[PDB]
Write an enzyme that holds these catalytic residues in place. Structure first.
Site, PDB file in Angstrom:
ATOM      1  N   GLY A 179       0.753  -1.243   0.000  1.00 43.33           N
ATOM      2  CA  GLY A 179       0.000   0.000   0.000  1.00 43.33           C
ATOM      3  C   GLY A 179       0.789   1.301   0.000  1.00 43.33           C
ATOM      4  CB  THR A 180      -0.739   4.651  -0.356  1.00 46.07           C
ATOM      5  OG1 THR A 180      -1.007   4.917  -1.737  1.00 46.07           O
ATOM      6  CG2 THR A 180      -0.565   5.953   0.410  1.00 46.07           C
ATOM      7  CB  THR A 181       4.444   5.169   2.136  1.00 47.55           C
ATOM      8  OG1 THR A 181       5.069   5.990   3.135  1.00 47.55           O
ATOM      9  CG2 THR A 181       4.764   5.687   0.731  1.00 47.55           C
ATOM     10  CD  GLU A 220       2.782   7.073  -2.301  1.00 45.50           C
ATOM     11  OE1 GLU A 220       3.790   7.183  -3.034  1.00 45.50           O
ATOM     12  OE2 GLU A 220       2.467   5.986  -1.756  1.00 45.50           O
TER      13      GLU A 220
END
Ligand code: MG
Ligand code: MG
Ligand code: MG
Ligand code: MG
Lengths: 111, 233, 229, 230, 240, 235, 242, 246, 238
Positions: free
Chosen positions: G28-30, G45
């Site tokens: 996943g997105t950080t 993000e």
């Protein structure tokens, strides 16, 4: 003991002509010997060219009118936008009222 | 099915040209015992709504809590929870009206009379009443309890009809409200000298006034009054 | 039972449809003078009394339906449809719309009871707002309106013949003959009044199942019309 | 061996049953959504099973200010739009408040989520485009049965969706400016949907259109009423 | 058969065996000893990540006013066991009018564990719990429960990867001393003894942030701060 | 609770299989009574045969059962049978007709056959009873919920052997004493053991006493079995 | 298949369904959290999948009560489910105890709920790792919660694809600011770390979202960083990336 | 998980009950001997470490003042059965008839609990065998063994677990129907010596008797119709006294 | 837990395998005369030493005018018979009329159908023949149900082991134009048809006659044995 009912006065009148109908009400709202409001309408346009008034205990009348307006909305949803005929409205209102046979809406209803 | 224990008395209100005013005293009575003197019964919700409550105080405090939750929850996942999607006076009222009527329908009422005063985002004054039975109505003036009997008559002399509202200034309206509060302290055995008043104006926003006192009281004539009929000294 | 294939279809629903392909044929044609439903009896033996084969049923005066597949599964759908039409009349003092009735049956269908239904339905009716109507209700919970449709073992063949023969001014009498015809073609047996059954719904007279003597006369009229070219 | 149920992760952290549910969308007839600042439009090409059959209804009204188009399992669109009708209804009755489109989004996401986490159930198998006009203007939403929802100026879902999604991706600055002009937003919608056709020229039965906006309640246009857009 | 808690042909429960394995996952050792009128528990504290707030990293739990517990096992399961025991000890007090004794709480948590041993829909918890107190009837007390549903009382005990080394070290001290407790009056000296014997058996020295200490006295269980632990470490560094 | 491709009930078949290893029990229906005899599987010198009961159970004053299968499964069903009898008596002020009680028990078994996902009871019963409608009656029920009535019958281990012998030596106009004898002889030739002793047996009779007009249930004491062994020449 | 059900321990004492859940998180997105001297800052993000996403509109940070921020990486729907439950859990604490919920207490509430979903074979673990916190009666607190239900307090925290970059950056801050760090600074620093961490994902362009809860900058209420101050931080990050 | 985890195999075996019996087989050995004026139950207190406290573990448990139990197999399984058994002695019996149940009926109820675990959904059978010794006014003294299946049987003497085979044998040689209790205790101590490996003293051996009434263990005087518990656990000191006179 | 599910070919295997248990069940037949219906059933051969006084024969009374016979699992049949008897009384109680035979059939068929689509239940290993007369009516009635819940009426019909065979017989021997106008020649046709499969036996074949107005009589070993003799004579006369 708590009394779940009150009486807010008022009076309503309906007359059918050959190609029209009127439903009329006073706009006064009362409790005991006081006036709550001089302008609180209690005759409503309900969609599908139906007018309704439920006169007596205004709390009950409001609930019923709300539940019928909502009935009409769902009638359109469930029956491909069909126009609710006045006879069909009447029968439906019977069922709303009778559903509360053992704890009734204290109102006289005219459509 | 219950009975009110600790109680609050009249809440009065009226609309003027630019907003609405609402007032209520700071007492909580216990039958005839004037028991608690620091009780706030005007409850502000946001910057556009005041909810004034009479009747059972324990139920009042329950309604406070509901209104605080209403605010919290409205903010959840809402970037405009305070812009366009901020809570409106009409929303707060329809919420309370619903609760009130549900509770009476279960034979377990909130033992209260409530006035919701405020200004809608389009500038419209909002003033509407609901009580323990779920009965609701609107008027240019509204009052509960004794206020219904004594304050309405006085306030209706300023605004008797809808068309009187643009003619009425904050100054005239606040004067009428303050006067009615004096009368109520004269004739209501469950009233108090200390009160709170709040104005919600479409320009000035919400002004909330605490610790007001009834002033300019006529008592002097009392000295001339002796006996109950024939007594001369 | 509620599993997806990697193609994104429901295993149990797709297999249900295979069960329907194994069933007796059912054909419906919708006109402006009525809607005709016809079925293939398919007695598993000559001893079986063919008039006890109920594959066309009344739902309300203005709504009939034919079935195909595991027909035992259809009792509870027919029951639900009847109750729904009658209830609507009770609550509203009027006839239920055909589409609404079909939607209600399809609603029942969705309710995955350990497995889907193994039966498709042709629902035919009339109502004032949308006129004569034909509907196909699959055990998926989806339904489709058709001018003409065929379901069961002869469907692929029959659907093609319906593509040819259907036009928006078929008289009811024409349409009846067409049902007999296409049934005659796709049935294993030779079509007669004991192994095929006709029905229609007209605004004026409602849903009527044709008796054997009236069906025989139409079979005879069909044979004679085809022996001209 | 890991695609038995939704209650199961694969070794790479994927949920196959959800991925397969997503697949049912790609078999759905194409549908397009797009919005200016004063309106939002849905255009949904309907698919027919046979030439004698209906081109099944792909647009469902949810309130006077909200509605959606579906691609995938129609029954699932009915379960979810029904829940949306109730949720919009609740907002009216209890609060006298029209339901925010965003708020509809969060509600659908949450309904879809539960179905990705409990044994016996199955993910929804339908993607939805949601348009509405509320207190913050026009809105278009894309719902995926995984429970992911996104707010967009425009988009498309169903078979060959990519064509229209590309056309719209470029036409962005042209349509976002179709304020106060209804017919020109439907045009742009129809002009977008064709970039994903192949089958044929879109006909009078092929087409379904829905508009909502500033003084326009959500209305569905079918047939004769859409003829002027082909 | 290796997924759920049914028997294997040898009459074994693989899931329970695997749960014992998990108790070592954190690579921590603890030990408990009894004084004359106190009970001490020591556990290693390992904060690898610089990013962590070290004050929140603990495996010792105050269960009630009088009962502490140390867990050997992963934290989610440890907290789940701590909540349940807190809840259980408060209930006991309300229903019965006296403080839940240490061994009764041990027995109760044991029985809960026994259920996961027996019912298929619940996995066992990958933890061992050491309960300590000065009981009003029994005196200094140590009771320890595992994923099998087993529990017993100890003179002293140790748990974790180097369990065995610590245990024998302790058995050896008791063989020589001939008594079943640390014959010291102050709890400070009992803690000092406990640390010393953990040093002598792990072949390791400790700074103040490498440990965690819990003491139980008559009517209180408390955990030491890094500062009180430092004062302990200083005092051992004049004996040893 | 599922069907095989052949139309058989896996778990039921396998339960009958379980029973086929249990100690044998025999029921013989005479003209003036009924015999129940049953062989205790697995014994030892130390097993307390005196204050013991494992194959013969009283259901009622007019009805007894002989058990082949899992003892503990059997107690479950015996207990609910005892209750059904009492409900019938409370309701009607008449002892329950044998068939009715038997039908009820079979129905309970059939239940596990058709629903719930629980294993069937690994038990077969022989029912010996008397009522005023059919007099003496012998019944049998097994895990399939099926029940049938018999002149003589056996359950558990070695039923084919025992069945053949009974068929060979039974006659309609028998008397109870002869049936007792027949029961013992039949067990004597089908035992998986050295020879038939008293400590390996349970024995019961239901007889309509000649002095009275009422029915008596006798569950033979250890010494009473030992005795009835000598008379018939098995010593 | 010691992985075909949740409540199953693998032979090494691990839970195989939980460890796959971790893979979904890493996928996943950080997102990050930074504890500062009297607050906490959160940043995430947001992958701009397409030009058609309405900017600043698909909000991912979530408030709980009025004082708690929540951000997460993994399956977004799983994150929402957790926040909904966090909110019910905060309401029930307030209703009964009047005081708004202390951050440690709120942390154990989520802990326990998440941990429950690793106990039964009829439920799957959560595919998210959640970073959350706020200011309560005694300080700012930051937490991260893993799909196992494991959580701890943190000086700084990161999860998702760019997690190691972020974790390294955070470590540099911890080491170089033993004195502390202002909410204002942490906001910029968060912006920097998100931009830096976007390197392990630099295919699609991204939108930055920050929020914060500071005693002296927000009165201890959670608010999103908007307009001026957001731009200031985007600028600061753009500048110090070259 | 609402289905039975114990099913029939094609051979007609019930797998899980067999495997439960195997677990019982690995258990420490326990025995009971019935005398004419008593019953004795005995077992070994296998200390897992010398740091563990032997006394703190009940291997021999009082169920009612006249009924004791001992076990072989899984300790934790036994511990919950003792609890459920004590409770059922009250709910099914004392709260109805105002007296404690007779041995066979209590045993019957325990057997019931174990049978249910053999058949209910989502559960595994109990991995224990119990020896239950007791007295009641009408049946006198008795001893029963209960197995994972829920089957039970009365014994004059028996032994379960690890070294059962040999012990059954040794008892068979030593048991007669005229034994005094002290004799049965002595025999029990001998049989136990063979199965035990390491230390063999009062602190590694647990023994209880069901003997005469112990008025001084009653707690109160006044009602002579109440005479007190027949169950008595022997003390560590009392065992050693009988060991020295081997 | 769904036991009755579809397979890729569109078949419910449990329903299918239930039919196999019926096939394995002892045979049953019914034929309907001009003013009667006759039901016939073969008798098993697992053991013989039975008491026939008490053992349940194969034809069950449902009401005084309706009978039910079955092939398949004996235990499953009791359950369907109970429910049928309960419904029969319930219909009288609420409609003041006894059940039509068709109604009682539709009821039983419905029950079997219901068990083909409920979690945790297996279908009925049973097919039924249901015979009798409607109240105040003389037209005879015969119906068949099967585990799937399908039902229909039959001039004549057979079910169970070697029904395949006996259906062949009846298909050429039963003339619709001329139903066996006597009770006698109706039993005759019913015995002939059972003989093809039974392999000679008086204690093998049982017969039950049902006439209008609740007239239902079972025959005796000897009464049947009379038909056994006259049929084996007229075949040996050729
Ligand atoms: Mg109408
Ligand atoms: Mg388990
Ligand atoms: Mg599990
Ligand atoms: Mg990491």
């Amino acid at each position: 003991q708590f009394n779940p009912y009150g009486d807010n006065g008022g009076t309503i009148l309906g007359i059918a002509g050959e190609d029209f109908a009127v439903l009329a009400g006073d706009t006064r709202n009362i409790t005991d010997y006081s006036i709550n409001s001089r302008y609180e309408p209690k005759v409503f346009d309900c969609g599908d060219n139906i007018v309704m008034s439920a006169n007596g205990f205004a709390a009950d009348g409001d609930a019923l009118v709300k539940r019928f307006k909502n009935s009409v909305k769902w009638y359109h949803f469930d029956h491909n936008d069909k126009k609710l005929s006045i006879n069909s409205a009447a029968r439906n209102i019977q069922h709303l009222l009778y559903g509360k046979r053992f704890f009734p809406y204290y109102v006289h209803t005219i459509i | 099915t219950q009975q009110p224990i600790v109680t609050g008395t009249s809440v009065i209100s009226m609309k003027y040209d630019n907003g609405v005013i609402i007032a209520a005293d700071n007492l909580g009575s216990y039958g005839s015992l004037l028991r608690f003197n620091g009780v706030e019964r005007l409850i502000p919700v946001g910057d556009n709504t005041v909810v004034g409550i009479s009747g059972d105080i324990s139920d009042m405090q329950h309604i406070e809590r509901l209104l605080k939750d209403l605010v919290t929850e409205n903010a959840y996942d809402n970037p405009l929870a305070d812009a366009e999607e901020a809570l409106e006076p009409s929303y707060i009222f329809e919420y309370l009206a619903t609760v009130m009527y549900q509770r009476r329908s279960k034979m377990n009422p909130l033992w209260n009379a409530i006035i919701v005063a405020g200004v809608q985002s389009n500038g419209d004054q909002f003033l509407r009443y609901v009580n323990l039975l779920g009965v609701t109505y609107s008027s240019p003036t509204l009052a509960t309890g004794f206020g219904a009997h004594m304050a309405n008559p006085l306030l209706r002399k300023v605004v008797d009809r809808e068309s009187d509202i643009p003619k009425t200034t904050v100054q005239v309206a606040e004067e009428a409200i303050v006067n009615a509060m004096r009368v109520l302290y004269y004739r209501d055995a469950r009233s108090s000298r200390n009160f709170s008043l709040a104005i919600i104006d479409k320009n000035t926003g919400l002004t909330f006034k605490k610790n007001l006192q009834v002033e300019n009281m006529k008592w002097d004539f009392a000295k001339d009054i002796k006996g109950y009929g024939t007594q001369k000294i | 039972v509620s599993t997806f294939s990697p193609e994104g279809r429901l295993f149990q629903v797709e297999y249900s449809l295979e069960a329907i392909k194994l069933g007796s044929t059912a054909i419906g044609i919708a006109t402006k003078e009525g809607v005709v439903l016809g079925v293939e009896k398919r007695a598993t033996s000559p001893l079986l009394e063919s008039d006890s084969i109920e594959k066309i049923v009344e739902i309300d005066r203005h709504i009939g339906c034919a079935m195909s597949g595991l027909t035992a599964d259809a009792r509870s759908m027919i029951e639900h449809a009847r109750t729904a039409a009658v209830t609507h009349n009770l609550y509203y003092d009027e006839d239920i719309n055909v589409e609404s009735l079909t939607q209600s049956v399809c609603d029942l269908a969705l309710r995955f009871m350990s497995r889907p239904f193994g039966v498709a339905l042709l629902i035919a009716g009339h109502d004032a707002d949308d006129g004569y109507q034909l509907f196909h209700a699959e055990p998926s919970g989806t339904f489709y309106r058709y001018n003409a449709k065929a379901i069961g073992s002869g469907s692929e063949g029959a659907q093609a013949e319906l593509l040819n023969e259907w036009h928006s001014s078929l008289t009811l009498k024409e349409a009846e003959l067409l049902v007999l015809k296409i049934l005659k073609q796709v049935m294993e047996e030779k079509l007669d009044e004991n192994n095929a059954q006709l029905s229609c719904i007209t605004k004026q007279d409602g849903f009527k199942i044709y008796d054997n003597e009236k069906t025989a006369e139409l079979i005879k009229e069909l044979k004679e019309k085809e022996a001209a070219e | 061996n890991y695609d038995g149920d939704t209650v199961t992760f694969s070794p790479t952290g994927r949920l196959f049953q959800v991925e397969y549910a997503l697949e049912a969308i790609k078999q759905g007839s194409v549908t397009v959504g797009l919005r200016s600042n004063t309106h939002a439009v849905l255009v949904a090409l309907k698919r027919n099973a046979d030439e004698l059959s209906s081109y099944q209804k792909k647009i469902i009204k949810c309130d006077e200010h909200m509605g959606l188009s579906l691609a995938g399992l129609a029954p699932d669109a009915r379960v979810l739009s029904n829940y949306l009708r109730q949720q919009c209804n609740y907002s009216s009755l209890v609060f006298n408040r029209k339901l925010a489109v965003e708020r509809a989004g969060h509600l659908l996401c949450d309904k879809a989520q539960k179905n990705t986490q409990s044994a016996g159930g199955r993910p929804y198998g339908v993607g939805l485009l949601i348009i509405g006009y509320d207190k913050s203007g026009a809105h278009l939403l894309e719902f995926q049965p995984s429970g992911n929802v996104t707010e967009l100026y425009g988009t498309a879902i169903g078979a060959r969706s990519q064509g229209a999604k590309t056309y719209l991706e470029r036409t962005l600055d042209t349509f976002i400016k179709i304020d106060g002009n209804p017919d020109e937003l439907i045009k742009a919608g129809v002009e977008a949907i064709s970039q994903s056709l192949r089958d044929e020229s879109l006909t009078v039965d092929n087409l379904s259109i829905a508009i909502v906006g500033k003084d326009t309640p959500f209305t569905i246009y079918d047939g004769e009423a859409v003829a002027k857009y082909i | 058969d290796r997924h759920i808690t049914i028997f294997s042909p040898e009459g074994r429960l693989y899931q329970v065996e695997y749960a014992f394995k998990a108790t070592n996952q954190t690579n921590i050792n603890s030990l408990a000893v009894r004084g004359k009128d106190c009970t001490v528990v020591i556990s290693q504290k390992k904060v690898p990540d610089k990013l962590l707030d070290p004050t929140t990293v603990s495996y010792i739990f105050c269960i009630s006013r009088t009962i502490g517990m140390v867990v050997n096992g992963p934290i989610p399961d440890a907290r789940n066991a701590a909540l349940r025991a807190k809840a259980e000890a408060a209930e006991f007090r309300y229903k019965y009018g006296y403080d839940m004794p240490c061994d009764v709480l041990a027995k109760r948590m044991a029985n809960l564990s026994q259920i996961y041993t027996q019912r298929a829909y619940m996995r066992p918890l990958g933890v061992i719990l050491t309960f300590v107190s000065v009981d009003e009837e029994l005196g200094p007390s140590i009771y320890k429960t595992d994923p099998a549903g087993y529990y017993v009382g100890y003179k002293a005990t140790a748990t974790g990867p180097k369990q065995q080394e610590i245990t024998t070290n302790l058995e050896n001290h008791f063989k020589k001393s001939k008594i079943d407790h640390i014959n010291e009056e102050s709890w400070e000296k009992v803690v000092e003894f406990a640390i010393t014997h953990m040093i002598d058996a792990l072949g390791t020295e400790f700074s103040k942030n490498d440990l965690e200490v819990g003491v139980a006295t008559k009517d209180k269980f408390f955990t030491l701060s890094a500062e009180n632990i430092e004062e302990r470490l200083v005092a051992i560094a004049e004996q040893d | 609770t599922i069907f095989s491709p052949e139309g058989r009930l896996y778990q039921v078949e396998y339960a009958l299989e379980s029973i086929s290893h249990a100690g044998t029990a025999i029921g013989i229906m005479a003209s003036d009574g009924i015999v129940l005899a049953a062989e205790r599987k697995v014994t030892s010198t130390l097993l307390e045969q005196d204050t013991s009961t494992e194959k013969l159970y009283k259901l009622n004053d007019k009805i007894a059962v002989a058990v082949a299968g899992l003892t503990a499964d059997a107690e479950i069903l015996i207990n609910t049978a005892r209750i059904h009898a009492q409900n019938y008596l409370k309701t009607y002020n008449e002892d329950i007709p044998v068939e009715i009680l038997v039908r009820r028990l079979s129905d309970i078994k059939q239940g596990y056959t058709q629903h719930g996902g629980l294993r069937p009871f690994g038990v077969s019963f022989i029912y010996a009873g008397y009522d005023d409608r059919y007099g003496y009656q012998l019944y049998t029920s097994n895990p399939s919920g099926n029940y049938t009535g018999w002149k003589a019958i056996s359950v558990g281990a070695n039923t084919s052997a025992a069945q053949t012998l009974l068929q060979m030596d039974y006659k309609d106009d028998m008397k109870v004493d002869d049936a007792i004898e027949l029961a013992l002889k039949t067990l004597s030739k089908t035992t998986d053991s050295s020879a038939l002793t008293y400590d390996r047996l349970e024995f019961a009779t239901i007889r309509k006493g000649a002095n009275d007009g009422e029915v008596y249930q006798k569950i033979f004491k250890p010494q009473e079995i030992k005795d009835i062994l000598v008379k018939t020449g098995i010593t | 298949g010691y992985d075909l059900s949740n409540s199953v321990f693998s032979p090494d004492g691990r839970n195989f369904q939980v460890e796959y859940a971790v893979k979904a998180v890493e996928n996943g997105t950080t997102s990050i959290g930074i504890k500062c001297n009297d607050g906490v800052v959160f940043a995430v993000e947001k992958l701009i999948t397409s030009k058609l996403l309405v900017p600043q509109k698909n909000v991912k940070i979530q408030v709980v009560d009025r004082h708690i921020g929540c951000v997460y990486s993994g399956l977004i729907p799983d994150g929402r489910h957790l926040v909904n439950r966090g909110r019910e859990e905060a309401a029930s604490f307030k209703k009964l105890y009047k005081t708004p919920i202390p951050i440690p207490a709120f942390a154990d509430r989520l802990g326990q709920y998440v941990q429950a979903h690793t106990l039964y074979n009829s439920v799957r673990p959560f595919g998210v790792s959640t970073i959350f916190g706020g200011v309560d009666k005694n300080g700012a607190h930051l937490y991260m919660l893993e799909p196992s239900g494991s959580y701890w307090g943190y000086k700084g925290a990161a999860t998702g694809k760019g997690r190691q970059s972020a974790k390294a950056e955070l470590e540099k801050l911890v080491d170089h600011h033993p004195e502390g760090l202002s909410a204002r600074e942490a906001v910029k620093q968060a912006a920097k770390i998100i931009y830096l961490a976007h390197e392990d994902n630099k295919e699609k362009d991204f939108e930055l979202e920050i929020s914060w809860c500071s005693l002296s900058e927000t009165n201890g209420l959670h608010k999103f960083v908007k307009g001026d101050l957001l731009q200031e931080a985007i600028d600061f990050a753009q500048k110090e990336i070259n | 998980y609402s289905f039975s985890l114990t099913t029939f195999s094609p051979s007609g075996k019930l797998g899980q009950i067999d495997y439960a019996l195997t677990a019982v087989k690995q258990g420490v050995t326990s025995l009971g001997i019935k005398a004419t004026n008593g019953v004795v139950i005995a077992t070994e207190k296998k200390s897992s470490s010398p740091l563990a406290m032997s006394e703190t573990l009940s291997k021999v448990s009082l169920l009612t003042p006249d009924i004791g139990a001992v076990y072989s197999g899984m300790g934790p399984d036994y511990r919950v059965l003792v609890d459920k058994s004590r409770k059922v002695a009250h709910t099914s019996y004392k709260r109805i008839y105002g007296e404690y149940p007779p041995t066979k009926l209590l045993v019957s109820e325990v057997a019931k609990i174990m049978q249910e675990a053999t058949q209910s959904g989502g559960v595994r059978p109990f991995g224990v065998s119990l020896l239950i010794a007791g007295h009641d006014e009408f049946n006198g003294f008795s001893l029963y063994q209960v197995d994972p299946s829920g089957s039970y049987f009365p014994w004059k003497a028996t032994a379960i677990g690890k070294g059962s085979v040999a012990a059954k044998t040794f008892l068979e040689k030593r048991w007669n129907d005229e034994l005094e209790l002290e004799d049965a205790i002595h025999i029990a101590l001998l049989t136990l010596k063979e199965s035990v490996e390491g230390e063999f003293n009062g602190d590694t051996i647990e023994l209880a008797i069901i003997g005469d009434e112990n008025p001084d263990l009653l707690g109160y005087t006044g009602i002579p119709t109440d005479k007190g518990p027949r169950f008595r656990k022997l003390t560590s000191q009392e065992i050693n006294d009988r060991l020295e006179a081997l | 837990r769904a036991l009755s599910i579809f397979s890729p070919d569109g078949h419910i295997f449990q329903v299918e395998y239930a039919l196999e248990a019926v096939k394995r069940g002892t045979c049953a037949v019914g034929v309907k005369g001009k003013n009667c219906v006759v039901l016939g059933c073969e008798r098993r051969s697992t053991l013989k030493l039975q008491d026939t006084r008490i053992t349940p024969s194969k034809v069950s009374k449902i009401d005084s005018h309706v009978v039910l016979s079955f092939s398949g699992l004996n235990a499953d049949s009791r359950i369907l018979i109970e429910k049928a008897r309960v419904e029969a009384q319930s219909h009288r109680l609420t409609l003041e009329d006894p059940v039509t035979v068709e109604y009682l059939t539709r009821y039983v068929a419905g029950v079997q159908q219901r068990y083909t689509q409920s979690g945790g239940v297996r279908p009925f290993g049973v097919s039924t023949l249901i015979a009798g007369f409607d109240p105040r009516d003389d037209e005879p009635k015969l119906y068949q149900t099967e585990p799937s819940g399908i039902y229909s009426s039959w001039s004549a019909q057979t079910i169970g082991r070697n029904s395949k065979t006996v259906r062949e017989f009846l298909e050429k021997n039963y003339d619709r134009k001329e139903p066996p106008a006597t009770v006698e020649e109706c039993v005759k046709l019913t015995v002939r048809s059972l003989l093809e499969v039974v392999q000679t036996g008086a204690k093998n074949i049982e017969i039950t006659v049902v006439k209008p107005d609740s007239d239902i009589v079972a025959l005796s070993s000897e009464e049947i044995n009379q038909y056994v003799t006259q049929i084996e004579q007229e075949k040996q006369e050729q």
